[PDB]
Amino acid sequence: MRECISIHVGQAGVQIGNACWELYCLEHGIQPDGQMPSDKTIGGGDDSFNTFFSETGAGKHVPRAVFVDLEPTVVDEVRTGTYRQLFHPEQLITGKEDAANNYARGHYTIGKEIVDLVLDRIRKLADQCTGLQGFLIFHSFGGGTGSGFASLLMERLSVDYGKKSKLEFAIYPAPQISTAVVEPYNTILTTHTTLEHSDCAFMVDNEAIYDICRRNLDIERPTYTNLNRLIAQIVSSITASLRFDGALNVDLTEFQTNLVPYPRIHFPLATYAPVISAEKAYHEQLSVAEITNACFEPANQMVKCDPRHGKYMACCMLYRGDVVPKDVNAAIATIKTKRTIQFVDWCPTGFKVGINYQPPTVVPGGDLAKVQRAVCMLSNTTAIAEAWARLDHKFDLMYAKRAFVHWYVGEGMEEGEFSEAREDLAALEKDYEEVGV
Amino acid sequence: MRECISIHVGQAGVQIGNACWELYCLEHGIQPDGQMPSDKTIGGGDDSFNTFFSETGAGKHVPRAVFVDLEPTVVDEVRTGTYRQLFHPEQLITGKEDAANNYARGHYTIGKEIVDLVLDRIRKLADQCTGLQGFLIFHSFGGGTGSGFASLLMERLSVDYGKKSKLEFAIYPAPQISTAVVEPYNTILTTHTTLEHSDCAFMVDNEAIYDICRRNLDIERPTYTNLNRLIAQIVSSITASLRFDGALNVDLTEFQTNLVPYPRIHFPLATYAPVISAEKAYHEQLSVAEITNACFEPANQMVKCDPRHGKYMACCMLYRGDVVPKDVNAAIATIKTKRTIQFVDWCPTGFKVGINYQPPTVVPGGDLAKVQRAVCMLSNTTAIAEAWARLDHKFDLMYAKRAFVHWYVGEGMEEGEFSEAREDLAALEKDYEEVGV
Amino acid sequence: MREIVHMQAGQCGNQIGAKFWEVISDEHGIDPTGTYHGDSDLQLERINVYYNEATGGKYVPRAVLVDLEPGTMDSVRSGPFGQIFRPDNFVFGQSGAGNNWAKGHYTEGAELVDSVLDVVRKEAESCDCLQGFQLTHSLGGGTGSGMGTLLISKIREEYPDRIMNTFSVVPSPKVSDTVVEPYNATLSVHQLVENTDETYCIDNEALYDICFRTLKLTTPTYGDLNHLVSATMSGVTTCLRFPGQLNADLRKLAVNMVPFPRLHFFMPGFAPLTSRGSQQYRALTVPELTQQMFDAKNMMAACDPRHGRYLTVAAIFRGRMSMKEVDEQMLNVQNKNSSYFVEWIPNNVKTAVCDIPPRGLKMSATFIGNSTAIQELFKRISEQFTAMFRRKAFLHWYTGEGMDEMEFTEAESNMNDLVSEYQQYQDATAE
Amino acid sequence: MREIVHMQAGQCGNQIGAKFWEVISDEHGIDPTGTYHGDSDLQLERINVYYNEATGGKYVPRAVLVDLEPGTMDSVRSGPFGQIFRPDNFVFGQSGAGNNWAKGHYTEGAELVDSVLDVVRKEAESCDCLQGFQLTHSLGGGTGSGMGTLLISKIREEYPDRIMNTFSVVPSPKVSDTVVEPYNATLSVHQLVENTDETYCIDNEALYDICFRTLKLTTPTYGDLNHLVSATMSGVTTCLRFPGQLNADLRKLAVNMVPFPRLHFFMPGFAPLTSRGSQQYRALTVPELTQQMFDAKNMMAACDPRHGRYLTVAAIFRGRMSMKEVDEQMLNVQNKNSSYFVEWIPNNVKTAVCDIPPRGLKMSATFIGNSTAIQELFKRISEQFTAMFRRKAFLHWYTGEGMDEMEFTEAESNMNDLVSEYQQYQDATAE
Amino acid sequence: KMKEITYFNNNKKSNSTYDRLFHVKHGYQNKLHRDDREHTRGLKVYEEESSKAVPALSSSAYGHRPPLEKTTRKHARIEHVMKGFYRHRGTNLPEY
Amino acid sequence: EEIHHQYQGLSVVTDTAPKKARKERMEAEMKQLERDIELLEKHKVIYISN
Amino acid sequence: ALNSLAPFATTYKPTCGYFFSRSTNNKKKQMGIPATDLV
């Protein structure tokens, strides 16, 4: 009944969803061909998967994701690989020619001649839905399909569906490391659109996940596979309260009305704990107090910023496993009485806890250990202004010599959009300063 | 016992009937030699085959088909094909030469030599029926036997029988894809005569159903065979109420008293759209509500004119198969709440539902996946004036130089027919405009 | 049951018809003796269209061999598939008169016209429906031009309802190849225009260009040229002979192609023509067939279609193919070369798919098109005609066989009127 | 699906393209005959990027070999892997331009260009995506330079929205290898820097250097040089053909490596390169690949990059690897040699990882770089051009065959404008 | 021989030019949009990349391993109100 | 296949008399072979008379 | 078959080109039929 539409835009979004649907199928028991090994005899009502999958007739569950991309490649091995049958053949919408790291090309060209088909697929999915409440736009801020077309689809979904919780999961460029050279341009241009259309946009870079894999996980060779599996674990811990019962169940409405103080500060940070490996998991007493401490550690943040320089407004604990609310109260009391973890003055009550009974599900061939306790700590801090200042400095370095502007200009997007996006993020930074003081 | 007699005139009509009688024999369990096996009968004296096949008593059944073409070909393919012993040799009538894309040859010179013979065969096959539902004419407006001789047959049938239902199925020329150059002349000459004699003209063009086969049935190199099977499925779903029972049944007067507001507004459009292939039907739950609102989009109407540019006037929705009479009304209520389509103000109630119990029958050799639900929606709509405007523009644009006129002139027809057909189509367009406003 | 009577007159017409009765004999399974040595049953349904049955299973062609001389009659009789013709349908004289339209039309060519007309009459009453007559001749000769158009006029007078077409080997723009060719061509088209309604203009250096820049073929010869002509012979009547998805006979591709009566000069073509070397390197698909059609490097008339606009176009396909692919290809080429088409008629292309291909080919094709680019040939012939007629050169061999300058002036006026109306209907705008 | 049409011009183009179509067809599994003796359907999924496959298993390429004299075409057809090419797309002239830009651009090279564009249009409309155009011409010759740049101008004029990549061999700093080479190269680059979206600038001292003292090889023949060119030529378009991790198409590389439109001259690099004796002493890992990339010796354009700064760098890794390896190595290069990088561009390195390495390599590395050190090539060529033009060197051919002195003047104008743009964007600071 | 990816194919039959050209097949399949572009559906990698012990694609690593856990069925949101209070057929009202 | 492989390796133009004759001899030989094995492949029995 | 179309053979008497051999006799053959003679 509690539907939720997942929309994977760009190569990063498609690969994140490729990990995510593997995790969802392993969690809910649906085999890669779409056929549950059991049927309606056992399992009782068997309505846990209805957030993502939809059983069709004989018993084949088809998910509620749209894999849309302008280049053919990655969605073709999605269509060809292990999950070829599980996805609907017209859900996996391909493009004709890649946007190729260009917001202008993703928003003023061939993105138009894919958007009607993807919108009609979205309407078909939502009319199949019977109580749809939220969207799961997974994409990247690197540029191209994941920025321009994702912004276009966000604008059209906002003007079509009206009020709807549109959760966004964005891949942010790290401070020292990024791939393309037009990532600053693409981030400023996509933030100008997603500032007023998204609702609780979660932000993740690659460097922090690499550091967590090297420190906690003992992975000397981390890669995009481990990155996307960790992000899949994050989103599974976010949406687990919809599908499994617990002491306190948290859905998207009370998620976003607790994590959004003002209708511009909607960029929280996601930290998972523990992200331990099995060897270090053997030598430990993994429990509520120390996983809250690991959540509030500055070394386990999944955005490359220092939360100790932050001014924490409101955070939600998402407990997953056999977690005792008394232990929750004790851990939150210790975190609140710690003094380096600084809260803002106008929100003393900034600890929204929600406990789910279902323990986390490990992926075979994975890296995370089996744990009886997990927290998806989601915090609306003020340390993201460091990221905004960094990317604004990168945009200024790009924009001083007007390098890489002629591609956008000859495509058709003008100088006014660059100026509007820069002044929009300047106003956003002054909004963080005004709310932080 | 509720017999209806089918006259297939022209090459398009003969090929369409060649698919239609294949589908009819498969539905009623009739082998191509003409006999029903003893283990493929309903038993207890079933009567759900006499609407299309009589019974010359030996165990053999012969159809009520009046296959007629002025050329020796295609009917010879019917005579030498696998459906050879099914038809009587006198039911398959051939002439000296084809009318060869000429309304004048089809209506005045060649057809006069064979019109008495085909009228005699129609008289015999009508007298053999205890009760006649009406006539099912199958032809093409492209030109030749299917245009001029079809008009001559309709004039003679209106003279002889009168007041009987005469459904015609006309292969209309598409706007951009077409075969002959005198197709506008042939359509303009036919629609002057079929206006005063028919009472329901189901018109289909080739480009729209090419798009249907490419998009929904994922055959992006289809052929006239596949078009004929889909048109056969449409006519089987419309005649499935003189046979196998169920809920509300709609017969030859039932879907005509509620489809024409005014007498010369008998030009509706058909849409059969659970057209889902085998690999795409397994990954979908084919439900009544979604097929119901799928049979309302411009991408699924099989006439190249969008229904948005025009107000709806009447809709007769013919379900088929396992359909509960609740979710039909629920889906129609949702469509009434939809603001995309627009009904006319003088028709508040504008939906007529027929429902059967027989599931659709699959032909071995077509894609046409096994579905338990079907809709054969027929809408009388003011958006059909776009095709009239297009072909009138083509007609005047060709007639400015008086090209291809001497072929009609030197055969038994004069230019006053061209002028009066121009005036009649101008009056028809004006009447559609006045009824729509 | 439609019916064609073949009439080969002149040297060129005799050789072309010999290769045509060669190329359709093995298509219908006929051996040189006359029996049916074949496999498919589809060749004995409309075999009556070209061959009538005879004593003891023998099929003989419904063809009339017409000449003022022996020679290539000896050649046709001696060559392979030559002892298949009935030895009575062999009307030939003994003068050796040639390259004189006067001697072929108002002289001894009018002596044998009664005999050949009685032969053709017996051929025609040997039929039951008689769709039409198909004549092969050369524009620019004596026997095939004069006697040919005389027979055209007599057949048009005696059966003024049936479809009758000529395959009209036209004179050559490059070089001359016969000195009195403009006179012969002028006087022949002056009779062809009012009588015929389907003239397939076939030119010689166009065929040389096809055989050399398309099939390599360093030794081209008249065998290859006549096989090129015979391919587009068979491609027009393949719909009559064999079943198809959308049939179209000669009357249909006449009415679909003639907007006004003096607008019936077509430009035939064939596809797929490929070399021996570039055969494994080529994919035999419908878009390749369509682009090889509408490329100007396939026309059998030496006039170039880029300087004019096509009036109407036919693409008779043979083989098993996809209807949507075929008519989508014609839509694509029309919308691409929309400037190379007249805009005062919409959808000026015609499809006719036959379900039987020729031997050894998956698919084949036949492009025949009424275009306004054919006026360049008539302008050249009229200019050569008035260049010779302004100084009365070679005119006494025509006036000594019973003519006058009034006929030459009438023919020149007809040429100028036909060229002027081609100009009018190529520059006539929509509105 | 992103087809790119491949083109060879001149003897340099013909030989480089012949070895390229050896290498990439060995990568995709095509035998000498043309069929598929491959290993996986991964090589077949995107095999139509380079090959217009026929019916069955024929896999001929979309390569146009063009020249003014047949020559090297007969050499290619006689050579190994030469029968794969289609006999239709061997258009050529008859005389031979040689090393005359006027003979390649205005004289009989300029009458072949109609047929050349005819073949280019045929191969372009026998597609559905048409990503771009590869040309492997010679910069500093005749038919390589003049006809190549004329073809680039025509193709950019008639399809002005496509990726245009030309590879080109650079005029040599040492030796000469051609006496009129500065004139030819200046006239080629004058028409080159308006239309080509990317030029790759391969150089014939670096090819000898990195096989003489990096690959040892004693006498290093010429096939090894052509193989070494074709290695990075294949490695650039790995994202268009093989799947894997984070990709970079041709347009992605163009938008990542071109900050301003007249800055699109890059330098190539292939960096698995171990000597034959010391192959087993090296540990082939991404840090070793990155060390071999960011090294002054390995660049195949001369232009010792310690004499300037890289504007942009792109690196295409090919193999089963980690992303943290490649991304951390690029971080290390940037943060270490930030002094030799452009300071006003943070993150001036694009990375692209495919997981299909070529034959004989577990791992592979392809370098490409827009540097502010490639102006030494253009500075030397402008200096040599001014040295010859002051004393009026070989010029009467050009002037009496159809050039003017003014054309040489705007050629030198674009020369010194381009080197001024490189110097001005090198010496500028961040603020 | 061993090459970068193993795939011990049995020489994948022969493709002789005479049989490829002059054995004419009138057997086009309508599932494609053009006859030449044949290798857009008949792609066979989905079982050989699973027969890999370690696969040749980074993207084909998501679900290569067999499942390990029992999915922990005990905590599931079993619907009892709006799926248990509604019973499909039968007004109570006995009819015997 | 052997004569086809030899014929495919000819020059781009055959302008001399031996080149023109060597093209045509191989073309005639290969098409005579084509007729021979077309007659062989079209049939299944093949009896030999004397 | 002697008149193939796809590998284009239009088989005639061995004249011209390579196969000219001062043979394949070019003397005309006897017609047999005398003439058309009503006189």
Ligand SMILES: Nc1nc2c(ncn2[C@@H]2O[C@H](COP(=O)(O)OP(=O)(O)OP(=O)(O)O)[C@@H](O)[C@H]2O)c(=O)[nH]1
């Ligand atoms: N976490 C994670 N990030 C990825 C992955 N793949 C790509 N990315 C991110 O994507 C960025 C590059 O931009 P893309 O997302 O590939 O661009 P796109 O959305 O595909 O649009 P185009 O550039 O037009 O192809 C890199 O900086 C990566 O951080 C992945 O598998 N996991």
Ligand SMILES: Nc1nc2c(ncn2[C@@H]2O[C@H](COP(=O)(O)OP(=O)(O)OP(=O)(O)O)[C@@H](O)[C@H]2O)c(=O)[nH]1
């Ligand atoms: N859907 C469909 N349409 C056909 C078929 N056959 C012919 N047509 C249509 O018919 C038009 C051509 O006119 P025909 O029907 O062939 O001619 P005719 O009505 O038989 O009259 P004649 O000229 O004497 O042959 C084309 O434009 C087609 O749209 C068919 O098998 N299926």
Ligand SMILES: Nc1nc2c(ncn2[C@@H]2O[C@H](COP(=O)(O)OP(=O)(O)O)[C@@H](O)[C@H]2O)c(=O)[nH]1
């Ligand atoms: N294609 C072809 N054309 C021929 C042949 N013989 C003659 N011609 C053409 O016929 C024209 C001369 O006409 P001709 O045969 O002398 O007419 P006739 O004197 O009435 O028989 C020339 O332009 C030739 O091109 C032949 O065998 N094949």
Ligand SMILES: Nc1nc2c(ncn2[C@@H]2O[C@H](COP(=O)(O)OP(=O)(O)O)[C@@H](O)[C@H]2O)c(=O)[nH]1
């Ligand atoms: N790789 C390669 N380079 C060549 C070849 N021939 C010439 N070059 C280079 O191209 C330049 C001269 O090219 P040139 O031979 O005049 O090309 P052309 O215009 O086709 O004749 C010289 O600087 C050479 O370094 C070749 O066969 N292979």
Ligand SMILES: [Mg+2]
């Ligand atoms: Mg991408």
Ligand SMILES: [Mg+2]
């Ligand atoms: Mg017909």
